[PDB]
Amino acid sequence: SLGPQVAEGENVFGVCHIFASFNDTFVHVTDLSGKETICRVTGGMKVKADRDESSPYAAMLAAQDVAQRCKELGITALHIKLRATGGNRTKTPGPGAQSALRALARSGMKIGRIEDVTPIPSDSTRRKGGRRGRRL
Amino acid sequence: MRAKWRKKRMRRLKRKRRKMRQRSK
Amino acid sequence: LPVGTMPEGTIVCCLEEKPGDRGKLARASGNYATVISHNPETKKTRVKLPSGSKKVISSANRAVVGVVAGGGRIDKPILKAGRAYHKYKAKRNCWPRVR
Amino acid sequence: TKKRRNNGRAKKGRGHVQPIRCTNCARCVPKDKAIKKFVIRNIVEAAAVRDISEASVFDAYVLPKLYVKLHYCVSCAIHSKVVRNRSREARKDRTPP
Amino acid sequence: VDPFSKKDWYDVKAPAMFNIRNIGKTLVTRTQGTKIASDGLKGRVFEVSLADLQNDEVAFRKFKLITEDVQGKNCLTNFHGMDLTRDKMCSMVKKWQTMIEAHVDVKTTDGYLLRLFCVGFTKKRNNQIRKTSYAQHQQVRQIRKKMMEIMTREVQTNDLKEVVNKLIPDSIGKDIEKACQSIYPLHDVFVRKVKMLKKPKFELGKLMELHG
Amino acid sequence: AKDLLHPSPEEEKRKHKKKRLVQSPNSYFMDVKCPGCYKITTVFSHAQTVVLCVGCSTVLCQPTGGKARLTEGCSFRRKQ
Amino acid sequence: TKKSLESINSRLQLVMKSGKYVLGYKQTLKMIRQGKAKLVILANNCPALRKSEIEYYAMLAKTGVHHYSGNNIELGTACGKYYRVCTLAIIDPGDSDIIRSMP
Amino acid sequence: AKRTKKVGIVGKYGTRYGASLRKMVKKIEISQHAKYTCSFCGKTKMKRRAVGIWHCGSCMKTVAGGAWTYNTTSAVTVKSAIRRLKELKDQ
RNA sequence: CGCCGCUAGAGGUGAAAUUCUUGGACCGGCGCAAGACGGACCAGAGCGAAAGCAUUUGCCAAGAAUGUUUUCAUUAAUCAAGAACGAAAGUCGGAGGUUCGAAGACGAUCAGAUACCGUCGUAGUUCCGACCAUAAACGAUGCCGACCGGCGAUGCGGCGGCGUUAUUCCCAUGACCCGCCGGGCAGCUUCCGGGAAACCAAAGUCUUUGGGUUCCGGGGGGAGUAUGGUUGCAAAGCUGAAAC
Ligand SMILES: [Mg+2]
Ligand SMILES: [Mg+2]
Ligand SMILES: [Mg+2]
Ligand SMILES: [Mg+2]
Ligand SMILES: [Mg+2]
Ligand SMILES: [Mg+2]
Ligand SMILES: [Mg+2]
Ligand SMILES: [Mg+2]
Ligand SMILES: [Mg+2]
Ligand SMILES: [Mg+2]
Ligand SMILES: [Mg+2]
Ligand SMILES: [Mg+2]
Ligand SMILES: [Zn+2]
Ligand SMILES: [Zn+2]
């Protein structure tokens, strides 16, 4: 492939959504348009187990794969959109997203600017604890 | 047995005693 | 007045199915359609009939604005057979509910 | 007897404060009773910013922060080891160093 | 399979008056079957920030730019919105200040109706020990009038080339700071969010004149 | 020990209106000498009505919680 | 406009006790053909023939028209008698200033 | 005198038709028989004709109102909206 | 839900499984419609008789405080009967019905779970007119008054302090700064003394005992139970023993 753009040093930008649950990890390369997904590797493919699917090892193995598929298609740089399940659930990103940011920087894929788009509600409808909440 | 659930059992007993009174008046 | 000249949210009654049929939908005592979601070109109009199914009608048809008087008629328990009997005696013989 | 003069919360002139749904166990605790903190956590942990400072287009102009109103209840506070026990004169005491 | 060798690659010309008119590139199947290439081109959005489009304004205070039409590998856009980031909006929010919102539905001179918000904080005046520093809630009612005054009369009788140029140095938000010191001193006032809602006509003759 | 009969006139201005020993109030009559035509207006300082003089026929006091304030170039004293 | 209306009830408290005034429709037609009345008061639900008729006698004899912002029942309570009344006139307001303030 | 101490107007049906039915007709036999205060003729001769028609004795002006009451919760609200959608800046 | 993209898993927990998935799940994108609810600002801050109350703007009456050389001249306090307000939960009909979610069914986890945990989910939550009158309705401290230590602040008013700063600059008010006054929620310290003690500026002015006034307890159990009346559509409320 002759790819999108040649004469580099001025990077071709993409957008890396990362969706860290506490028990799954997404890395999702899009361009700036928003609709056109290049690559979607989860933590749920690279991990054969069913609880280390949120690990840094889950994330970094997801991070190698996308950066490899992005080294083929000729795009160079990636902005970073970042989140967790922010409806009524927790708002910290999990222990994987803070590690996939490391491994994207290692295997190619130079970095744009990073933003924290976790959708913060205003109304906050009822969260699933009950009255007395979670027990043990 | 809590005084909470002690009140509930005195209630549950009294309601059957009530429906026994109103049965054979 | 036509539905293309009222703003959306207008609670109307006796509006028309297709224009020039002189009043068909939402005529009974205490019913109302409410014009929502105009289409500027392709002159059409979504309306919530008194069921809840949004029909889209042609927007040259006219609707007398407001609810039909007699709203909340059925709130009286008829409560005796004769008053059940006289209601349907003026209408038609549809009364014999023999199971 | 009274373990505290506050009786835990800080409703003093009022009669009713809205509950804030907790984060961990999601038990609704009124906010003047709840354990309350605010963390300016950096978006990348500082060992890995040096990766990202050297792999960026800009001259380390990109430095963003992650603000969380992080909101605990008093059952899951000590259960997560924030709000250590103190002593009978040490309950009187105020803001940490 | 590689459908990413089937996909053609447009690049997006930005509008005028920022500093630069190139943003990036996109992906689209050029054509096939019933489909037209420009099917998807008309609605793809972009949320790209400043400090590459301005020669160094504030690096936050993004914009929402949607791709408008098709023109020979240079698909082209138009203004759709201004946003900010969640960090900087949650930055500068201390527990002992007070946050005063103002938002107004307002028509531009031509057919575009925009809703733009506003956010201000009260300022801790220098030489201060009394740490509360709030507003009496009547001057909050007065200063919502202050912003909903100016954001009408610096938007209502103006065009987009007037008002999008008012967004870039925040010429409105600086002026609200200067006018309203006699009520209470304020602290880092921004527009926060602007949202489009009515777009009556396509007008590509207005679109190209917006570029050259 | 402490004094009641002979306190200091520093102390008793500071104390509240009806909390001292003689309880005489804290308002005064002020001699608004407007340049209108001729008239010297005696007017209560802690006023409540718009004190409109009869010659010049404009405003001389603002109704304000506490005490009135004067409008433009009005001079005054106390009558004692 | 609440400081306007509450004044008018205090205004109708004045003429009710000191000034001279007439109560009803026929009596306010006799007083308006004499040129005698000063200010006519119109209640809000009077029939539109009667309303614009009293206007037409006003524009002849050049007598001030006021539309009371209220139903005829509480016009009767404003004029301080338990029956209801549509049309009043104020035929000699002695100490009053109704015919002073808005006109 | 307080003759019937609970039922009021539904002392005419008497022994029968069930308790919670007569409770639920009492509220609405009162409403259709009262002499409502007319907004036009000033008097209280608002008397209903047949269902959905209301009628005042003096000035003889006939108004379609509610089916049992004079107004409806719908009636005030739609009058609230229809002026509000009228003064919405030319229609 | 309707479409554009991408693709094998996706929620789920200490683990897993039920549940959703090449018929396209999740994840990105543009919109659209519905209902609950107003996040962060949010405090040992405010107002409310109590339960209580948080987006802006209008509208309607109401109120404490403050300033008062205004006013009637004791019109006062606390209250057997009697009356109105009274969270959530329920009961009755009316509108719709997002999320949470009693019962209900399921998967685990245990010897057992009908339990915590997980998934689906009624009644309920929500709005409209009626009901019911209970709570840890807690300051677990009746209300009015008089007095007896301090300081540090603060919230709302009022006065003063020719030190700044915003309109344009006298001219007013803003914004802080150092005050003094009043009443307010709270705090710190103290051997005023009180307290069985914890502790308390009121739980002090008490054997050196008498300010005025209302409600009440009298060893634990049986028990607010039986039975009466009384109210409530009902669920239940108020009043209330005795044997032993
Ligand atoms: Mg049948
Ligand atoms: Mg049958
Ligand atoms: Mg003890
Ligand atoms: Mg409480
Ligand atoms: Mg299936
Ligand atoms: Mg008494
Ligand atoms: Mg309730
Ligand atoms: Mg029922
Ligand atoms: Mg029914
Ligand atoms: Mg569910
Ligand atoms: Mg002050
Ligand atoms: Mg008492
Ligand atoms: Zn918790
Ligand atoms: Zn009539």
Swiss-Prot record, chain C:
Keyword Transmembrane attributed: no
PTM info: The modification is impaired by hypoxia.
Intracellular or extracellular location(s): Cytoplasm
Keywords: Cytoplasm, Hydroxylation, Isopeptide bond, Ribonucleoprotein, Ribosomal protein, RNA-binding, rRNA-binding, Ubl conjugation
GO cellular component, one term: cytosol
Residue location of crosslink Glycyl lysine isopeptide (Lys-Gly) (interchain with G-Cter in SUMO2): K48
Keyword Ribosomal protein: yes
GO biological process, one term: cytoplasmic translation
GO molecular function list: RNA binding; rRNA binding; structural constituent of ribosome
Miscellaneous comment text of the record: This protein can be partially incorporated into E.coli polysomes in vivo, indicating it can replace the endogenous protein.
Similarity-based family: Belongs to the universal ribosomal protein uL2 family.
Biological role stated in the UniProt entry: Component of the large ribosomal subunit. The ribosome is a large ribonucleoprotein complex responsible for the synthesis of proteins in the cell.
Subunit architecture: Component of the large ribosomal subunit. Interacts with CRY1.
Protein name: Large ribosomal subunit protein uL2
Full-sequence portion shown in this chain: 102 to 200 of 257
Curated annotation (Swiss-Prot), chain E:
Residues modified as N6-acetyllysine: K13, K35
Keywords: Acetylation, ADP-ribosylation, Cytoplasm, Differentiation, Isopeptide bond, Nucleus, Phosphoprotein, Ribonucleoprotein, Ribosomal protein, Ubl conjugation
Keyword Ubl conjugation (UniProt): yes
Coarse class of the protein's main subcellular location: cytoplasm
Record cross-link Glycyl lysine isopeptide (Lys-Gly) (interchain with G-Cter in SUMO2), residues: K13
Top-level taxon of the source organism: Eukaryota
Post-translational modification: ADP-ribosylated at Tyr-134 by PARP1 in presence of HPF1.
Modified residues (ADP-ribosyltyrosine): Y134
GO function terms (MF aspect): mRNA 5'-UTR binding; RNA binding; structural constituent of ribosome
Key word Magnesium present: no
A Gene Ontology cellular-component term: nucleus
GO biological process: cell differentiation; cytoplasmic translation; negative regulation of apoptotic process; ribosomal small subunit biogenesis; translation; translational initiation
Subcellular location: Cytoplasm; Nucleus; Nucleus, Nucleolus
Similarity section: Belongs to the eukaryotic ribosomal protein eS1 family.
Subunit structure as annotated in this protein's UniProt entry: Component of the small ribosomal subunit. Mature ribosomes consist of a small (40S) and a large (60S) subunit. The 40S subunit contains about 33 different proteins and 1 molecule of RNA (18S). The 60S subunit contains about 49 different proteins and 3 molecules of RNA (28S, 5.8S and 5S). Identified in a IGF2BP1-dependent mRNP granule complex containing untranslated mRNAs. Binds with high affinity to IPO4. Interacts with DDIT3. Part of the small subunit (SSU) processome, composed of more than 70 proteins and the RNA chaperone small nucleolar RNA (snoRNA) U3.
Name by which UniProt lists this protein: Small ribosomal subunit protein eS1
Naturally occurring in which organism (per UniProt): Homo sapiens (Human)
Entire-sequence positions represented here: 22 to 233 of 264
Curated annotation (Swiss-Prot), chain G:
Modified positions (Phosphoserine) in chain numbering: S4, S10
Keyword field contains Cytoplasm: yes
Pfam families: Ribosomal_L7Ae
Cross-link (Glycyl lysine isopeptide (Lys-Gly) (interchain with G-Cter in SUMO2)): K20
Signal sequence region: none
Sequence positions bearing N6-acetyllysine: K20
BP term (GO), one: cytoplasmic translation
Compartments, as annotated in UniProt: Cytoplasm
Cellular component aspect of the GO annotation: cytoplasm; cytosol; cytosolic large ribosomal subunit; cytosolic ribosome; extracellular exosome; focal adhesion; membrane; nucleus
Record key words, sorted: Acetylation, Cytoplasm, Isopeptide bond, Phosphoprotein, Ribonucleoprotein, Ribosomal protein, Ubl conjugation
GO MF assignments: RNA binding; structural constituent of ribosome
Top-rank taxon, per record: Eukaryota
Task performed by this protein: Component of the large ribosomal subunit. The ribosome is a large ribonucleoprotein complex responsible for the synthesis of proteins in the cell.
Subunit (UniProt): Component of the large ribosomal subunit.
HAMAP family tied to this protein: Ribosomal_eL30
Family under the similarity heading: Belongs to the eukaryotic ribosomal protein eL30 family.
Protein's recorded name: Large ribosomal subunit protein eL30
UniProtKB/Swiss-Prot annotation, chain H:
UniProt zinc finger (C4-type) residues: 38-59
Signal peptide (residue range): none
Keyword vocabulary terms for this entry: Cytoplasm, Metal-binding, Ribonucleoprotein, Ribosomal protein, Zinc, Zinc-finger
Main location: cytoplasm
Keyword flag Glycoprotein: no
Binding site for Zn(2+): C38, C41, C56, C59
SUPFAM superfamilies the UniProt entry points to: Zn-binding ribosomal proteins
Location of the protein in the cell: Cytoplasm
Annotated GO CC locations: cytoplasm; cytosol; cytosolic large ribosomal subunit; cytosolic ribosome; extracellular exosome; focal adhesion; nucleus; synapse
InterPro entries: Ribosomal_eL37/eL43, Ribosomal_eL43, Ribosomal_zn-bd
GO annotation, biological process: cytoplasmic translation; translation
Highest taxon, organism lineage: Eukaryota
MF-aspect GO terms: RNA binding; structural constituent of ribosome; zinc ion binding
NCBIfam families for this protein: eL43_euk_arch (TIGR00280), PRK03976.1 (NF003058)
Subunit structure: Component of the large ribosomal subunit.
Family, per entry: Belongs to the eukaryotic ribosomal protein eL43 family.
Function of the protein: Component of the large ribosomal subunit. The ribosome is a large ribonucleoprotein complex responsible for the synthesis of proteins in the cell.
Protein's name according to its UniProt entry: Large ribosomal subunit protein eL43
